[PDB]
């Protein structure tokens, strides 16, 4: 027998006077899977079904189980429970976000920011598209590596204080990285006007190289490297 203590954030919007409070659960690790999501599923299925959370692929590629585990915003199906029984695992929602119900954050603003950068290929002549494949060299494709793999789980954006204090105006690492993901793409012709979209102090220049985004990424991506690479392009671009 190996019981593990879990401290989970709980709030019920369907009850009047209910304040944010922590709830404790005990689970045998021998009956449970290795990952945190396995335990979240286990208490949902066995102990308390009142727990409400996002889950889907349990593979680490959909980005549903995005939450704060022990002071770190990572995927619950990617990160495993600490076998050390002395430590109690603290499970929280994504930092500085409007809680809908139990670890489920409102990402309506996050998704809307991703729409504003226009994450689709834009050609000058779209009359000849849909009939032939565009040519891209092996080196030009290597520039997209470490950028396209973004799951949009919103772990990096919800980790930096600049997205905490300036959530409305500042886009955040996840959104800015994807703007850069379409910049270096040799097929895109709108590179100049994509940079001209960030010519306000809040949208891009609200980053101060705090480096909390890249430290918490589940996929091991570096948004900060991309963000600083945007600043270089913004400083030196034609017209």
């Amino acid at each position: 027998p190996r019981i593990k203590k879990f401290a989970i954030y709980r709030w019920d919007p369907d009850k009047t006077g209910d304040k944010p409070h922590m709830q404790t659960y005990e689970i045998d690790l021998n009956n449970c899977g290795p990952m945190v999501l396995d335990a979240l599923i286990k208490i949902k299925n066995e102990i308390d079904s009142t727990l409400t959370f996002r889950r889907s692929c349990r593979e680490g590629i959909c980005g549903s189980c995005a939450m704060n585990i022990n002071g770190g915003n990572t995927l619950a199906c990617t990160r495993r429970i600490d076998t050390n029984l002395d430590k109690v695992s603290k499970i929280y929602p994504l930092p500085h976000m409007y809680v809908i119900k139990d670890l489920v954050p409102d990402l309506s603003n996050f998704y809307a920011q991703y729409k504003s950068i226009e994450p689709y290929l834009k050609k000058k002549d779209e009359s000849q598209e849909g009939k032939q494949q565009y040519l891209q060299s092996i080196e030009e494709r290597e520039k997209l590596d470490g950028l396209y793999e973004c799951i949009l789980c919103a772990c990096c954006s919800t980790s930096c204080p600049s997205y905490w204090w300036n959530g409305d105006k500042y886009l955040g690492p996840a959104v800015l990285m994807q703007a850069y993901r379409w910049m270096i793409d040799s097929r895109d012709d709108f590179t100049e006007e994509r940079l001209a979209k960030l010519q306000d102090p809040f949208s891009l220049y609200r980053c101060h190289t705090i480096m909390n985004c890249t430290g918490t990424c589940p996929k091991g991506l570096n948004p900060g490297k991309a963000i600083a690479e945007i600043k270089k392009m913004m400083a030196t671009y034609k017209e």
Partner: protein, 138 residues
């Protein structure tokens, strides 16, 4: 629906409801590269306040600089105490100097990976101690 209309309806819903904000500074784990960012502001703001106090006093308060130095000698110049007085000025200055270069290296794009952040962070933290103690004994 458009791109900015979703952002408008985001704030018009949450602020008109009783939804709580998920904890941010209360729960997140303290890391060195992140803690050094706070101290860069901590030094920055206080160090700019030192210059602001130096300029405003020179403009508003009467008397020359040489007469003000004799006013400090009224405390009878404690050898170990005056060392600590000058140390508390070079420490915020030299921390912001070495870490300021690190930010300029980041602007070029060099060394933005997690291991290189901690490596260059300790370099700055150690250089801070050496330049603070070294320039205090002059």
């Amino acid at each position: 629906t458009t791109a900015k209309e979703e952002m408008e309806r985001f704030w018009n819903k949450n602020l008109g409801s009783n939804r709580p904000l998920s904890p941010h500074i209360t729960i997140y784990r303290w890391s060195l590269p992140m803690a050094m960012s706070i101290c860069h502001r901590g030094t920055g703001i206080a160090l700019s306040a030192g210059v602001s106090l130096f300029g405003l006093s020179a403009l508003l308060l009467p008397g020359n600089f040489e007469s003000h130095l004799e006013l400090v000698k009224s405390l009878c110049l404690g050898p170990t105490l005056i060392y600590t007085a000058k140390f508390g000025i070079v420490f915020p200055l030299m921390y912001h100097t070495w870490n300021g270069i690190r930010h300029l290296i980041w602007d070029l794009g060099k060394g933005l990976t997690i291991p290189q952040l901690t490596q260059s962070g300790v370099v700055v933290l150690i250089l801070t101690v050496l330049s603070s103690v070294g320039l205090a004994a002059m």
